[PDB]
Amino acid sequence: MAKWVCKICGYIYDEDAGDPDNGISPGTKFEELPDDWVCPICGAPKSEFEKLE
Ligand SMILES: [Fe+3]
């Protein structure tokens, strides 16, 4: 699946990995993340991510 980079801190949201520690199961598409989801490293909002394609 897709990978999205947090432009603030360089954290890669990997859809394949999800973000379980923050309520996100593997295979969760970035667009399907709750609007309140933020980068688990720097706290940047979704808006600060860019899809790596
Ligand atoms: Fe970040």
Does the annotation list 42 as a binding residue? yes
- 30: CB partners within 8 A, 6+ apart: 2, 4, 13, 15, 46, 49, 51
Phi, psi of 20 (to 5 degrees): -55, -45
SS3 of residue 17 by DSSP:
coil
Interval between CA 11 and ligand 1 midpoint (Å): 5
Method: neutron
15 Cα to the center of ligand 1, angstroms: 15
User: Which domains are delineated in the chain?
Assistant: 1-53 (2.20.28.10)
Angle (nearest 5°) at CA 3 between 16 and 21: 50
Backbone angles phi, psi at 46, to 5 degrees: -50, -35
**How close is the Cα of 10 to the center of ligand 1, in Å?**
6
CB neighbours of 17 closer than 8 A, spacing ≥ 6?
26
CA of residue 17 to ligand 1 center, whole Å: 16
Distance CA 11, CA 33 (A): 15
- Stated resolution in angstroms: 1.8
